[PDB]
Design a binder for this molecule. Structure first.
Ligand SMILES: CCCCCCCC/C=C\CCCCCCCC(=O)O[C@@H](COC(=O)CCCCCCCCCCCCCCC)COP(=O)([O-])OCC[N+](C)(C)C
Ligand SMILES: CCCCCCCC/C=C\CCCCCCCC(=O)O[C@@H](COC(=O)CCCCCCCCCCCCCCC)COP(=O)([O-])OCC[N+](C)(C)C
Ligand SMILES: CCCCCCCC/C=C\CCCCCCCC(=O)O[C@@H](COC(=O)CCCCCCCCCCCCCCC)COP(=O)([O-])OCC[N+](C)(C)C
Ligand SMILES: CCCCCCCC/C=C\CCCCCCCC(=O)O[C@@H](COC(=O)CCCCCCCCCCCCCCC)COP(=O)([O-])OCC[N+](C)(C)C
Ligand SMILES: CCCCCCCC/C=C\CCCCCCCC(=O)O[C@@H](COC(=O)CCCCCCCCCCCCCCC)COP(=O)([O-])OCC[N+](C)(C)C
Ligand SMILES: *[C@@H]1O[C@H](CO)[C@@H](O[C@@H]2O[C@H](CO)[C@@H](O)[C@H](O)[C@H]2NC(C)=O)[C@H](O)[C@H]1NC(C)=O
Ligand SMILES: *[C@@H]1O[C@H](CO)[C@@H](O)[C@H](O)[C@H]1NC(C)=O
Lengths: 299, 48, 61, 235, 218, 247
């Protein structure tokens, strides 16, 4: 530890973690960003919130944390608390619960060239406007917008990460370790870097890294528990045309009791449909249609 | 009344089947687009 | 019998013997880097994973 | 997962070195529920207090003496300002010092017990009495004439009301599987009773509407139900 | 200790992602794991070792819904292609749990059985009573109201159809088939002699080839 | 009971005094609350563990040594519910403020003394700004008393000996329950008298009566979610529903 402690003491002499690393004026600190999704926890439609477990890989370089390994016994890496180094204050801008920041402030890994690696994990609840027209056969386009809270484009250059020759323009997902969400399947997972050309350069949050999640709902629960029973119970009402039109035929009993069952189904779906008002959900349209059909059968 | 029942049975069955098929096919054709961004030919997956 | 390699990634080569008629090499990338798993059999790989199943001795590497 | 006290307050320090600390706490503690006699049940809930780090060779525990003293073994409840829980009555509230087993080569704790009885008036009003009424109605379907044509309606709507009360109870019952609550046993018993009322009503309606020209009478049926059993049943 | 030995036993509430199979619910078996490792240290600077092959279950409070059949802890070394000298270590503790099914047996399966038994009983109701479809449609109503109970009780997942879901759908389809066939029977019963002439095949099948109980009068 | 309350604390600190003429006629100073001694007044009546005020604002000190502090707070307290006359019931909740850090020997609690026309009076009530107050959607406030309570039962060295209690006696506005539950329940229950007019050949009497019973059961299902399952009394609507179901 003597070489590690020596290096830490020599590195932390006069180091201000609240001052951006710039060796010359008009220097822009390049920050490369990658996002790994470990599990899509949920999408609550009534709060319009996507809850996700992510690991954010941030890489930048700090000239003040440079050292030569030969002066420290061949030490080639150092684990430093993330509070003691300068950090790009990257936050999820579109958060719905007020949590802008990462869940755990782990150690950074400083290299002899001064290049800092940081992989904090985070629980994020992000705002996802739910398009309800085809519910429960819908797909959603959720967004995760990452930007610096304090620094501008003349101070940090926030870009997507580069692996060997190729830019990672997607959310990374472990093929082996990923467990699919029980109600949502990820079809597309791109990433983009957006910078409005006419935006003020001195303002902080204009260079954004946006990760998109296009997710398709698996509707099997609604098919099994709601849609097919409702279809069957509504099709029962068609049978009254074969009952006799006399006392004991029981046409009206059958039709109106089918309507009562449909009202019970209205109560069942009432606790599950989103409560926005741009569009009528597909399930609500179908239940209204089945109701009207039963009304016409009774008439 | 019997012949009236037989006519209106076919009418109501046609209505029920047509509405059911319309709703189910609007459900069936709502697929995610083949590309993440319309007007952009790229697919944004890691090449192998 | 069948003599198949079983080392991980770029480790020193090591070898085992099994009863299956095929060796397998399984390549996938995690958040840190690339992992290669070598063994015998032909496992059912989940999508996004490269698999090379070969039926000759010491064919993983 | 909360181990600590609710508020950081002062400690009273005497000149001889005595140290008295009376912090407040809000504690959610694990209580294994015995569900067998719910909602006529009583529960034995427990609060185990102990030093998390120091062992018996460093910190030795004893039960807290009250102002009464005399080696108390009880939770103290100030009778003036204590408003009793509307659902629970405290039958016993003892306190004990649990010592761990001897090590050949768990820590000592002070345990406070609350034996508490549920007050079941809500379930008597909302579940038991309607079930009694529905059972009484299920009895009287057999007094309904077959010619009125209202046996199936009464019996199945009684079953439907029972299902509504099952929906009522679904929000309140414990969800464990070590036993069945007695109220659920009563509900299932009543459901089986109404089901059997339906079955026997269907049998009676079958007998009442047997086609005379197709169905001929077995002579044993004529001997029993026309000649023998009526004078026993008062018909 | 005076030798520099450190023991640290903090508590935690672990909320771990585990793939849940709902196929055999409520008779389902789960295998759920806890992967633990040093976040920022690889195996060359920090080595983690299991204290024992088994998780410690001596102070385990017994659960009212799950029984842990087996449990184990496995250490894993991970080597990457780029760095053949630095391992990455983890310890994964897994527990195999079996659901206690009594709650769902009593509160879901038994009423479904009762509604299923009453489904066929409409075929012992004579048509002249005029109560057949009252019975059938009211049993359907009871099933539809109990659907609320089932949805309130079971987890709502779309990963697979559970056994309770299959039994519920079977019971509902059973009731609907009973309703359809009862309507057919009632239509056959009320066939007028004048408008509907009797087919010869119907008379042959249902009146002539009847070697069944002769309690009947052809 | 959940309340938003601004608690006003006043006390003289003889160390924090100055003559204004030696400091440019400065007559007021704003300081962080963490720099001065505080009595540490907390809500003892809380039921969620949040004893303390929410926002620890600045204190105002004056040349006389007086310290004024108006921390706002959001408090969740235990209000036992009497269900006897529901939904025509009124509740008596209290907010009990005291110091758990100091006893009667260390601090003395009292009500604020205000002045009108040069005559002082104790503020014996909860202050509500008439212009800015928005009434609760279902609870009207009838009484707002304030008291200083010192009980002799507890020992004198107990911090719970003295307290200042602010009471809210509040009446429920029954309009929602009258419109949505009570009136439909009564009108369906009174249809049970109509089976006596139904003929026995065309009027299905038992179906109508058992359907009234079913509707009563649905209303019990509605009511059961909205009240605690206490045993002090039966709710008034519960009494009517039991009576109607027996009938
Ligand atoms: C009487 C009580 C109030 C009626 C009038 C309300 C005033 C009003 O804004 O009208 C609105 C009533 O919106 C409709 O278009 C009708 C309701 C939707 C159609 C039925 C849904 C299922 C149909 C399946 C069978 C019209 O406003 P709008 O925004 O033009 O309507 C939404 C447009 N949309 C219906 C195409 C989605
Ligand atoms: C499953 C187990 C069923 C238990 C039911 C049972 O014990 O019978 C119940 C009767 O039966 C009733 O349901 C009482 C009628 C409704 C209560 C209304 C009066 C309130 C009683 C009180 C005013 C027992 O109720 P009880 O006979 O009143 O005795 C209970 C003791 N108590 C007086 C403290 C309430
Ligand atoms: C009269 C009819 C209605 C009245 C009683 C209502 C039934 C519920 C009931 O009391 O459970 C009964 C039958 O419950 C079972 O179903 C047996 C338990 C085994 C479940 C499947 C076994 C394979 C009895 O419960 P039990 O299940 O026998 O639980 C006792 C065993 N245990 C406590 C060790 C778990
Ligand atoms: C479920 C409901 C019962 C299902 C089985 C009934 C069988 C049946 O058809 O009725 C039986 C009633 O035989 C009698 O003579 C009447 C017996 C019932 C009254 C006395 C005992 C029951 C009441 C105790 C107090 C036999 O009648 P069947 O005319 O012989 O029916 C032949 C039908 N088959 C050809 C399909 C077999
Ligand atoms: C509020 C609206 C309430 C509406 C109630 C009407 C209910 C439907 C039936 C109406 C016709 C009844 C009828 O013709 O009966 C008789 C007429 O005499 C009467 O009408 C009886 C008295 C009716 C009083 C109505 C209010 C009190 C009861 C309310 C009960 C329901 C309460 C419902 C509350 C929601 C017919 O017989 P008669 O012609 O008298 O000839 C025989 C004479 N003799 C007996 C002397 C031999
Ligand atoms: C910071 O990032 C920018 C890209 O956002 C880098 O710019 C380009 O880098 C390539 C490869 O080195 C050069 O061929 C281009 O000429 C660069 N373009 C610009 C804008 O100059 C830039 O080099 C990065 N800076 C550092 C210090 O790595
Ligand atoms: C303050 O006001 C008084 C008023 O009499 C004046 O005499 C004095 O000079 C002023 N300034 C200071 C610093 O006291």
């Amino acid at each position: 530890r003597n070489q590690e402690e020596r290096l830490l003491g020599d590195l932390m002499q006069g180091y201000n973690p609240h001052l951006r690393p710039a060796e010359h004026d008009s220097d822009v600190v390049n920050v490369s960003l990658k996002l790994t999704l470990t599990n899509l926890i949920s999408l609550n439609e009534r709060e319009e919130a996507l809850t996700t477990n992510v690991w954010i890989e941030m890489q930048w370089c700090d000239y003040r944390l440079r050292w030569d390994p030969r002066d420290y016994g061949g030490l080639w890496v150092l684990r430093v608390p993330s509070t003691m180094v300068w950090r790009p204050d990257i936050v999820l801008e579109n958060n719905v619960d007020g949590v802008f920041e990462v869940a755990l402030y782990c150690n950074v890994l400083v290299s002899p060239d001064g290049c800092v690696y940081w992989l904090p994990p985070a629980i994020f609840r992000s705002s996802c406007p739910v398009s309800v027209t085809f519910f429960p056969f819908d797909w959603q386009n959720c967004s995760l917008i990452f930007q610096s809270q304090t620094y501008s484009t003349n101070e940090i250059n926030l870009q997507l990460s580069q692996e060997d020759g190729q830019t990672i323009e997607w959310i990374f997902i472990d093929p082996e370790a990923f467990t699919e969400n029980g109600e949502w399947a990820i079809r597309h997972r791109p990433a983009k870097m957006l910078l409005d050309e006419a935006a003020p350069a001195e303002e902080a949050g204009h260079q954004k890294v946006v990760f998109y999640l296009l997710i398709q709902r698996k509707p099997l629960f609604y098919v099994i528990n709601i849609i097919a029973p409702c279809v069957l119970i509504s099709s029962v009402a068609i049978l009254i045309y074969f009952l006799p039109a006399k006392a004991g035929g029981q046409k009206c009993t059958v039709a109106i009791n089918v309507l009562l069952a449909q009202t019970v189904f209205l109560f069942l779906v009432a606790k599950k449909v989103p409560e926005t008002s741009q569009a009528v959900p597909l399930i609500s349209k179908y239940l209204t249609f089945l109701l009207v059909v039963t009304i016409l059968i009774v008439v | 009344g019997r012949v009236l029942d037989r006519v209106c049975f076919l009418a109501m069955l046609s209505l029920f089947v047509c509405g059911t098929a319309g709703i189910f096919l609007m459900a069936h054709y709502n697929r995610v687009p083949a590309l993440p961004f319309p007007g952009d030919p790229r697919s944004y997956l890691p090449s192998s | 019998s069948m003599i198949c390699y079983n080392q991980q990634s770029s480790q020193p080569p090591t070898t085992k013997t099994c009863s299956e008629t095929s060796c397998y090499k399984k390549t996938w990338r995690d958040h840190r880097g690339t992992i290669i798993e070598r063994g015998c059999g032909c496992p059912k790989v989940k999508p996004g994973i490269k698999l090379h199943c070969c039926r000759t001795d010491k064919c993983n590497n | 997962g909360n181990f600590d006290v609710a508020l950081d307050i002062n400690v009273v320090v005497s000149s001889d070195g005595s140290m008295r600390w009376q912090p407040p706490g809000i504690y959610r503690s694990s209580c294994s529920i015995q569900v067998t006699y719910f909602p006529f049940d009583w529960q034995n809930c427990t609060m185990v207090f102990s030093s998390y780090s120091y062992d018996s060779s460093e910190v030795s525990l004893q039960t807290g003496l009250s102002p009464e003293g005399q080696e108390r073994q009880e939770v103290y409840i100030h009778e003036g300002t204590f408003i009793e829980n509307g659902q629970w009555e405290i039958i016993h509230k003892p306190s004990r010092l649990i010592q761990p087993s001897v090590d050949p080569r768990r820590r000592e704790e002070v345990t406070f017990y609350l034996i508490i009885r549920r007050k079941p008036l809500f379930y008597l009003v909302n579940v038991i009495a309607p079930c009694i009424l529905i059972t009484l109605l299920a009895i009287f379907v057999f007094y309904l004439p077959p010619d009125a044509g209202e046996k199936m309606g009464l019996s199945i709507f009684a079953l439907l009301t029972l299902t509504v009360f099952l929906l009522l109870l679904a929000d309140k019952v414990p969800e464990t599987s070590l036993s069945v609550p007695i109220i659920i046993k009563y509900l299932m018993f009543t459901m089986v009773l109404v089901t059997f009322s339906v079955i026997l009503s269907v049998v009676v309606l079958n007998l009442h509407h047997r086609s005379p020209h197709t169905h001929q009478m077995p002579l044993w049926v004529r001997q029993i139900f026309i000649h023998k059993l009526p004078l026993y049943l008062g018909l | 200790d005076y030798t520099g030995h450190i023991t640290w036993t903090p508590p935690a509430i672990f909320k771990s992602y585990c793939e849940i199979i709902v196929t055999h619910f409520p008779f389902d078996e789960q295998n759920c794991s806890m992967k633990l490792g040093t976040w920022t240290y690889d195996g060359s600077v920090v080595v983690i070792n299991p204290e024992s092959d088994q998780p410690d279950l001596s102070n385990f409070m017994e659960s009212g819904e799950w029984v842990i059949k087996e449990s184990r802890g496995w250490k894993h070394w991970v080597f990457y292609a780029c760095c053949p000298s630095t391992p990455y270590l983890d310890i994964t503790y897994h527990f195999v749990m079996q659901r206690l099914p009594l709650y769902f047996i009593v509160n879901v399966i038994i009423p479904c059985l009762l509604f299923s038994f009453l489904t066929g009983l409409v075929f012992y109701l004579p048509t002249d009573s005029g109560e057949k479809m009252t019975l059938s449609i009211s049993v359907l109503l009871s099933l539809t109201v109990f659907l609320l109970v089932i949805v309130e009780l079971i987890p709502s997942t779309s990963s697979a159809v559970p056994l309770i879901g299959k039994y519920m759908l079977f019971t509902m389809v059973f009731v609907i088939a009973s309703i359809i066939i009862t309507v057919i029977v009632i239509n056959t019963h009320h066939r007028s002699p004048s408008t509907h002439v009797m087919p010869e095949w119907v008379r042959k099948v249902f009146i002539d080839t009847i070697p069944n109980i002769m309690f009947f009068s052809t | 009971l959940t309340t938003n309350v601004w608690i006003e604390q006043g006390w003289t600190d003889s160390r924090l005094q100055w003559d204004a003429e030696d400091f440019g006629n400065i007559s007021v100073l704003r300081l962080p609350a963490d720099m001065v001694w505080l009595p540490e007044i907390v809500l003892e009546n809380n039921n969620d563990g949040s004893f303390q005020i929410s926002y620890s604002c600045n204190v105002l000190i004056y040349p006389s040594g007086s310290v004024y502090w108006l921390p706002p707070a959001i408090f969740r307290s235990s209000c036992p519910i009497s269900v006897t006359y529901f939904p025509f019931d009124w509740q008596n909740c209290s907010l009990k403020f005291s110091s758990l850090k100091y006893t009667t020997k260390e601090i003395t609690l009292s009500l604020k003394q205000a002045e009108e026309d040069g005559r002082s009076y104790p503020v014996e009530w909860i202050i509500i700004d008439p212009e800015g107050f928005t009434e609760n959607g279902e609870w009207e406030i009838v009484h707002r008393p304030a008291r200083v309570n010192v009980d002799p039962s507890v020992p004198l060295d107990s911090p719970n000996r003295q307290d200042v209690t602010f009471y809210l006696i509040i009446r429920r506005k029954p309009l929602f329950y009258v419109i949505n539950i009570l009136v439909p329940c009564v009108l369906i229950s009174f249809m049970i008298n109509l089976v006596f007019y139904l003929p026995a050949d065309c009027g299905e009497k038992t179906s109508m009566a058992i359907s009234v019973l079913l509707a009563q059961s649905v209303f019990l299902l509605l009511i059961s979610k909205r009240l605690p399952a206490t045993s002090m009394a039966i709710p008034l609507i519960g009494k009517f529903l039991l009576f109607g179901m027996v009938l």
